[PDB]
Every structure is written in C-alpha cells, then in structure tokens.
C-alpha cells in the first residue's frame, strides 16, 4: 500500500533522526581528539628538538601526510598492493563490504573497479545464496538430529520448529559471531567490544574500515589469514539467511 | 547442486585472483613511489636537523600518521562540525543502507556499542522500505512506459520487441536519472572529475561505500540541505539498482 509505505518512510526517517541525535550526543564531544593529539605531538617534538622551527615541522607533517595518502606506511612486507593484499581488496568489493582502509589512487584503478564490481557482486551473490542454502542445509540437518529428541519429549512440532530456529541462529552466532570475536581479541590485540564491533560491522557489509583483520598474513600463524577469509564467506552466508527470513517475516507483517 | 557450488567457488576464486593481478598492476607502482617519497622526506629532514635521530623521527612519523588516520588535518593547529545534526543524520543513513563510507569514525565505546544495535534493527527495517519503494518506483515507471508503448504497437513493431525496447528505455531513463544525472550534478558540486563522480555514484549504489569519495563531506561547503537531499537520491537509486 502506497499509504503504508509513506508511513514506513516516516518511521525510518524518525529512526534516522533518533540515531543522529544519539551519535551526536555521544561523539561530538570527541570530534577534535585527533587534532589535539597531533598538536601535542608537534609541541612535544619542538621542545625536544631546538634545531626545528614550528613552521619547518609543519611542512614535514604535510609532506608525510601526502605520502601516507599515496599509501606509504611508517617504517621501523607492508605492501597493500602485493598479490595477497590485492586479492583481499578484490574480496572487499564483491562482498560489498568495502573497508577502504586502502584507497585506489589511479583513474584506471577506479575505472576497472567499476566493471569489476558490476560483474563481481552478482556473481558473488550467486555463490553466497549457494553457500547459504548448503550451510543452512548442514545446520538444519544437524539440528534435525536434536529435533528428534524434542519430538519424542512430546513438545509440539510447532515449538520444535521454533526451538530449532533459535538453535539455528544461536549455534551460528556461536561459530560466526562469538568464536571470531574471541579469536580477534587475542590475535589483533583489540578489546572484546572492538572485536564484536568489527565482526558485526563486517558481516552486515557496512565495512567502515576503522577495524580490519585479514589484509596481511601473520608469520608464526599461517592458518590465520585464510581462516579469516573462510570465516567472512561462511559468516556472510549465515547472516544472509537470517536477514532473508527475518526480512521474510517482516514483509508479510 | 554440490558439483556446481564447487565450480562456482573455483570461478569466483579465479575472478578474485584475476582482480588481484590487475589492481596490483595498476596500483602497486604508485604505492611503491609514495613509500619512496616518505623515505626521501625523512632523509632530507635528518640532513637539515642534526639534533634528530632517524629513530626519533621514526616515532614522530608513526605518531603523526596515527593522528591523521584518526582524521586530524595537517594544515591547521587546533569552526564546523562533522557530528552536527545533518552529518549525524547522514552517518546513520550510511549504516542502515550498509553503505558505510566511514570517512568519520566513532571514537567512543558507547558509540560503537549503540551502532551495533542501531544497525541490527536498522538494516532490515530499511530493506523493507527499499523493497516497498522498489515495487512502487517500478510500478510508476512501468505505468509511464505504457503510454509510449501504445505508440510502438501501432507502428506494428512486434509486441515481443516492444517489450525489449521499453526495457532499454526503462533502464536508460533510470540510468539517466540515477546514474548520469547525479554524476553530472556531483561533477559541478564537489569539483570532482566525471570519472571520479561516476566512480562515487557506483561505489555508492552498489553499497560498497569505500569512503574515499563522499558527497557533502567537504568542510568548506555552506550546504545544509545538500547532504540529506543527496540521501533522497541514494534512496531512490538503491531501490531501482536492486532490480
């Protein structure tokens, strides 16, 4: 109904405005922290190095910024367009996650990226649907074994279907939300909260890019980097199935 | 079909590896240059400032980089707000659309925590509205097409081709309204190149949302109605790209 969709627009609109109010309340007070820290770093340096003018240090910081903006990394191995990192980057496209912690610098890069995505995303969506059905099959099949127990306990077949869905997501959650967060906690030296933040920002395909795990491989733990890719793949499909059915429940409502 | 799933996986895999090869070919040389330039800057500074060890300059650069990475600006020493009501509205939009430009980061644990639940509830809610607008937008377009379709059928073009021609027009006009029109708009408004603008448009409507390009983010612009109004486009454009 057009009448109802206008209502829905207005609702969303309120969900946005309400969001805006909260984020502003929580974040505006710290808008400037990074500037403050940069300035502290400058002033601290000047006090330690009498042979440097503020203005000279200024130029250094501009020049550093330009190079970083071109993809330089502070050195004290780190190439974001080596084969492995470029592979990862391509993944971030077709998944639509788009962390963007590394930007394309060339017009050719951008141009190519357009066609790469138009063709890549739907291609990936297909595989994802496929893995979603196959993963859900495996899960629902395993849960079916536990369902056998409930039905013998004379719990109504309607509730058993519900309990299995709860189990369906709860076990997935455990494997694809909880397990990874604990993993990344230890591996990335993030806090639990940072890790869950990352996980969920990732599996929703929001992909802010303030946190990123698997862009580069880790010596002394080879299985890490692939397992992360494997994880994103499996996790996305699990998340997708949840959204389609919760989307499924919602539209009829 | 288990056979096909495995084939598809291998295909994708090849699509990635092929992507990787290309991006590396197109980007690495530029990156390796930047890395060189950073080092040239260091070595130049050392030669001009004997009171500074290489290792000390190293820490400075790391610390500067971290702050810039947090969105500090090299130019000034310290008015406009990235979390004013309009930009916060925009930011929320970037979540539920799953676009996630991320050119402004949440700094607080509360911000992050809230953001999690805001999205879990917000994205499906938005998906619903999007389906709704998708059907309604296509309906209105299809109705408008019908009147011009009457002309083709009288011109004795087969009804099968008239359906094809209309689809061409259907997408071409949508494309015109949601791809071409915006790109030309942003070209002039953001001082981007045509290629930058299309890049932005598409990165956006695909919901990739890199965040290298963001309309209205520019600090200098006196453009309050601009940034939410662009979201009006984003809404309509997304529902139409869903097709």
């Amino acid at each position: 109904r057009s009448t109802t969709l206008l209502a829905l627009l207005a609702l969303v609109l309120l969900y946005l405005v309400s969001g805006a109010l909260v984020f502003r309340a929580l974040e505006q007070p710290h808008e400037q922290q990074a500037q403050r820290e940069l300035g502290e770093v400058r002033e601290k340096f000047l006090r330690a190095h009498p042979c440097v003018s503020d203005q000279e240090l200024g130029l250094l910081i501009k020049e550093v910024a330009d190079a970083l903006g071109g993809g330089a990394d502070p050195e004290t191995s780190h190439s974001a367009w080596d084969l492995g990192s470029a592979f990862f980057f391509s993944g971030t496209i077709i998944t639509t996650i788009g962390y963007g912690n590394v930007a394309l610098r060339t017009d050719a890069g951008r141009l190519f990226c357009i066609f790469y995505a138009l063709v890549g995303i739907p291609l990936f969506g297909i595989l994802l649907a496929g893995v979603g059905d196959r993963l859900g099959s495996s899960l629902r099949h395993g849960i079916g074994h536990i369902e056998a127990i409930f039905l013998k306990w004379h719990v109504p077949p309607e509730l058993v279907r519900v309990l299995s869905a709860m189990l369906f997501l709860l076990i997935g959650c455990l494997l694809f939300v909880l397990t990874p967060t604990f993993v990344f906690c230890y591996m990335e030296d993030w806090s639990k909260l940072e890790a869950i933040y990352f996980v969920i920002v990732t599996l929703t395909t929001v992909g802010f890019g303030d946190y990123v795990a698997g862009a580069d491989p880790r010596q002394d733990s080879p299985a890490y980097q692939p397992l992360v890719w494997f994880w994103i793949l499996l996790g996305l499909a699990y998340f997708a199935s949840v959204l389609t059915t919760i989307g499924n429940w919602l539209r009829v409502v | 079909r288990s056979t096909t799933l495995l084939a598809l996986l291998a295909l994708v895999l090849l699509y990635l590896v092929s992507g990787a090869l290309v991006f590396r070919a197109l980007e690495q040389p530029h990156e390796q240059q930047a890395q060189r330039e950073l080092g040239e800057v260091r070595e130049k500074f050392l030669r001009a400032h004997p009171c500074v060890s290489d290792q000390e300059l190293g820490l400075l650069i790391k610390e500067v980089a971290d702050a810039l990475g947090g969105g500090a600006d090299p130019e000034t020493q310290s008015s406009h707000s990235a979390w004013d009501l309009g930009s916060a509205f925009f930011f929320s939009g970037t979540i539920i659309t799953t676009i996630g430009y991320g050119n402004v980061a949440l700094r607080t644990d509360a911000g992050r925590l809230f953001c999690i639940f805001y999205a879990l509830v917000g994205i499906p809610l938005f998906g619903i509205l999007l389906a709704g607008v998708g059907d309604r937008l296509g309906s209105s377009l299809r109705h408008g097409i019908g009147h011009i379709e009457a002309i083709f059928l009288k011109w004795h073009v087969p009804p099968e081709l008239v359906r094809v021609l209309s689809a061409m027009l259907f997408l071409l006009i949508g494309c015109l309204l949601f791809v071409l029109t915006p790109t030309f708009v942003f070209c002039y408004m953001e001082d981007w190149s045509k290629l930058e603008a299309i890049y932005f448009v598409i990165v956006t409507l695909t919901t990739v949302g890199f965040g290298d390009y963001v309309a209205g983010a520019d600090p200098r612009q006196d453009s309050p109605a601009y940034q939410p109004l662009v979201w009006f486009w984003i809404l309509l454009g997304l529902a139409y790209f869903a097709s």
Partner: antibody
Amino acid sequence: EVQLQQSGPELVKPGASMKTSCKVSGYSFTGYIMNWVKQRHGKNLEWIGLINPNTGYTTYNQKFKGKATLTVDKSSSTAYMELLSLTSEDSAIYYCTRGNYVFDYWGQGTTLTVSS
Amino acid sequence: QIVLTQSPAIMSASPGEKVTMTCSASSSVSYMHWYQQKSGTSPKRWIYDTSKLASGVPARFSGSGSGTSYSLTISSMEAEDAATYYCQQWSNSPPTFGAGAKLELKR
C-alpha cells in the same frame, strides 16, 4: 676544529664491566647525535648504538642490546659507554663518532683488553 | 640489517693506476658513504652522500652509484692512498658498513 677525545686504553677481568668516555669540543655537544662503533682487531666496523645527548634517547643494535649502555653528561659535554659481563669476544677498539646519517667525526678510539 | 658487500676485499694498485671499489646493497639505498682508515688510526669520513668529498680529500677521489650499487674511484693512485675503505648506509636504521676493501701499493 671539532674533536672527540676518548679516554685511554682499559684492561679488565673477564666478567667485569667497564665504562669509557668521549669528551667533545669544537661544537655543541647537545646539537648532534653520538654513536659508538666496535672494531675487533682490524675487521668490520659494527655500529653499537646511539644516544641523543639532548633528549637522552638511545637505540641499540640488537646484537648489543643487553651488552651496552649509553649515557651522557651534558654539563661536561661527555658521552659514556658501559659494557657488561665482558668476555674475550669484547676485546676490541671502540670509537665514539658523531652523526645522524654519516659519521663525520670520530674519536681516536679506545682499546679494550679482556684478560686474566 | 641491509647488507653491504665490498668485493674483492683486497686489491692492489701501482701509482698512476685508476682504482675502483664497489659496494652493493642487499636492497635499495638512497645514499652511500665511505670512510678511509689507515692502520693505527680511526676511520675518516672520506666521501659522503654518495659523491660529496670531505674536507681533507684530494680531487682524485670521486664517488657514484644509486639504488643497490655504489662505487668509490681514484682517478690516479698515489702512495698515501693505500688504506682500507669502508662503505656505509643509513637509509634504514640500523646503519651498516661494508666489511671494507684493503688497498695496497703494487711494486
């Protein structure tokens, strides 16, 4: 005429430690980075580490991490190196030298002899 | 831990001969420096930033190179040129030296 004047040769027992010095004159001590370099009888030169006399900052060659401690005395514009738990492997000539990219002025060196 | 290789480690020249010693780097380097050492005494900065001459140094000495390969040259050998020459780099901490090239007089 810049000059780095090192202290004389030193002779110490295995296990003991030892401190040696480098006084600068002809320029301002705190304006430049000081390094130390090891040369074991007439062979490759080894950078031990550096100190920034103005800031007290030190970094070391990983080889020498636990072995060597650099310090300065600003007032007497003098740089010090301490070497720990000496073995015969440490017997060498040690230089103080100035620089943050090239080593442009060197002390005359000091010879350390570790022996019973 | 950039590695500098001077090879050969020993060489000998008659007076009047042109001499060239080389320094190759394990990975690229923006400047090379050279020291001259005569037995008994500390090294002397001889050439720095690849091709700049230190104060004492006569013109017959020159330096060149780039990236991963650098060289020190004597246009015409003299007696007082007999010494060991070392290359060194500080394009990456930690700074490092070649193992030196000993130059004796031929006779």
